[PDB]
Design a protein around this ligand. Structure first.
Ligand SMILES: O=C(NCCO)c1ccc(Cl)cc1
Ligand SMILES: O=C(NCCO)c1ccc(Cl)cc1
Ligand SMILES: O=C(NCCO)c1ccc(Cl)cc1
Ligand SMILES: O=C(NCCO)c1ccc(Cl)cc1
Lengths: 237, 300
């Protein structure tokens, strides 16, 4: 059924699973037309498909050409997401295919269920967690490859860099969700925290800076602080 | 005009004949129903006075044989039986008619309600759903499960309705996933109409059969089947115009006949609001929407 705080360690067991977030598949800018009406212009998007145990990210880039001449794009986007996840699964060897796929929004359940009818043994599940994967496009390297794509493309990342060499997947997911939650609540302050110090760099093959264990404690502390100052300002605390 | 004689009425029972019902007292001198119109299929149903659980009854066509009802004190129910000795049967019926021990199927000038409810119900078609080959009539009760319910446990006692499942490979062409899920015309017109039913007459018959079983016996499996068959048509963008017009008439008479006190449970709020107000056919069921809105505006 639905995934929540009570069955949260199941993410880190040895059953292969993937989160699918569709919140950046269909992206637009709204603008005024010469006649003073409003129009949208689509920009490149992405499906965010993540293995929470390994950190393996299957970033499928959604090029704007996929919307040309199509109607009802927000509905189509959900079905296009499910089409692309189904294609990914089928491209994997059987022993790499997920046992479960967790969608971050319940409107993805029926489209994904229908596209995966050929896979009756794969469970399609929702979640009550309010996960901050929409902020994936606040990661500079992910935003860059999406916005430069001129055609449909799948790019593979490890969203944990080398963290699993030093911490568990439970701890690595916690750090990821904290970083993304901060980026979502105030992106500028979040990025200032991460990039203020010019002597901590991001390796060419990584997404985040090469923080020592101690610096990560400092960083993580600064992200919590940021999330509370705005959570309390929300309801004036 | 045909006759369903009764051996006796040893237990107090509410007896149902199509949309009519009457009470018989324990050991009352009751010997059946006469003047049953020939040319229509019928249902005789039962509700014991001592146990409201297990409404049960028999679907039958008087043109297919001489049938009587006799109470079995071992199995504890009124059973339908076939008398093959036509002379003995003629001899018995005439005795009961002379002593005026039979109630009469009513014959009013202003009525076509049973015909409108059973237009596509056939006895031979009924036997494809309710399997009991050695009898010409078909037994149904409240508790009988459907083949699909048995997929979600005695197969001999099941209702073999046509399985309808909108998230199934039968329903969804590979590569047409969003198209076929959002517009069920493929499933209706090709899978079901052209490859299972053969014609709309047959689609309407199973739907009619499903509603009556749900209404007369409180068979949950029948109710599910009736709503599924309505939803498939209403969720299809491409439906022949004659089918929509007949569906409107069919549903109108089902809603008109439904006991007001069982609407709350007999009608699925989600299916009906979807069908009348959201679906492709939201504008195509004028008579049904009018009676629903004037009779059960709470469900909507
Ligand atoms: O034969 C009859 N009953 C005993 C057999 O169990 C019988 C047959 C037909 C009618 Cl109408 C009534 C009784
Ligand atoms: O309607 C009947 N009884 C009175 C109800 O108020 C009734 C119905 C059908 C037959 Cl066949 C006989 C009596
Ligand atoms: O044709 C029917 N459907 C089943 C085909 O397998 C049908 C027709 C009429 C009735 Cl009453 C019941 C079923
Ligand atoms: O849902 C039903 N009953 C209420 C739960 O007790 C139900 C619906 C339709 C039929 Cl025909 C029977 C039961």
């Amino acid at each position: 059924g639905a995934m929540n705080s009570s069955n949260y360690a199941e993410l880190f067991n040895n059953d292969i699973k993937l989160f699918v977030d569709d919140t950046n598949v269909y992206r637009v800018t709204v603008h005024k037309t010469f006649e003073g009406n409003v129009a949208t212009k689509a920009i490149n998007g992405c499906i965010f498909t993540l293995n929470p145990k390994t950190g393996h990210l299957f970033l499928k880039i959604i090029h704007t050409s996929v919307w040309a001449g199509q109607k009802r794009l927000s509905q189509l986007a959900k079905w296009k997401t499910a089409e692309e996840v189904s294609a990914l699964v089928r491209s994997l060897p059987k022993e790499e295919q997920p046992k479960q796929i967790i969608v971050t929004r319940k409107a993805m359940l029926d489209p994904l269920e229908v596209h995966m009818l050929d896979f009756p043994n794969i469970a399609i599940r929702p979640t009550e967690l309010r996960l901050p994967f929409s902020a994936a496009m606040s990661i500079d390297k992910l935003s860059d490859v999406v916005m430069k794509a001129t055609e449909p493309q799948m790019v593979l990342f490890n969203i944990y860099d080398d963290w699993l060499d030093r911490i568990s997947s439970y701890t690595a997911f916690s750090r990821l969700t904290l970083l993304l939650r901060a980026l979502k609540t105030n992106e500028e302050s979040a990025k200032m925290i991460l990039l203020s110090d010019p002597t901590i760099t991001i390796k060419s093959y990584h997404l985040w800076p090469s923080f020592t264990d101690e610096q990560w404690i400092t960083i993580e502390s600064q992200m919590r602080d940021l999330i509370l100052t705005e959570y309390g300002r929300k309801y004036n605390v | 005009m045909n006759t369903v004689p009764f051996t006796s009425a040893p237990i107090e029972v509410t007896i149902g004949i199509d949309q009519y019902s009457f009470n018989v007292k324990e050991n009352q001198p009751f010997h059946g129903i006469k003047d049953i119109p020939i040319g229509h299929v019928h249902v005789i149903h039962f509700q014991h006075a001592d146990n409201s659980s297990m409404r049960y009854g028999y679907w039958f066509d008087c043109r297919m044989g001489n049938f009587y009802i006799q109470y079995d004190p071992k199995d504890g129910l009124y059973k339908m039986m076939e008398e093959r000795d036509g002379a003995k049967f003629e001899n018995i019926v005439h005795n009961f008619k002379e002593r005026q021990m039979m109630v009469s199927y009513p014959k009013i000038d202003e009525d076509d309600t049973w015909y409108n409810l059973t237009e596509f119900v056939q006895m031979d078609k009924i036997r494809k759903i309710v399997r009991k080959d050695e009898n010409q009539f078909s037994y149904v009760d409240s508790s009988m499960t459907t083949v699909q319910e048995n997929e979600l446990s005695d197969p001999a006692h099941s209702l073999n309705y046509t399985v309808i499942n909108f998230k199934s490979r039968e329903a969804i062409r590979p590569g047409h996933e969003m198209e076929d899920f959002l517009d069920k015309s493929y499933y209706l017109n090709t899978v079901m109409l052209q490859g299972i039913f053969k014609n709309s007459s047959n689609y309407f018959g199973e739907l009619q059969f499903a509603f009556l079983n749900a209404m007369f016996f409180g068979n949950y499996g029948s109710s599910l089947q009736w709503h599924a068959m309505i939803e498939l048509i209403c969720s299809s963008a491409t439906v022949p115009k004659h089918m929509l017009d007949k569906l409107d008439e069919i549903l109108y008479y089902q809603i008109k006949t439904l006991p007001e006190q069982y609407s709350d449970i007999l009608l699925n709020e989600r299916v009906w609001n979807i069908c009348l107000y959201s679906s492709f056919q939201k504008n195509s069921l004028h008579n049904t929407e009018k009676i629903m809105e004037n009779k059960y505006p709470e469900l909507l």
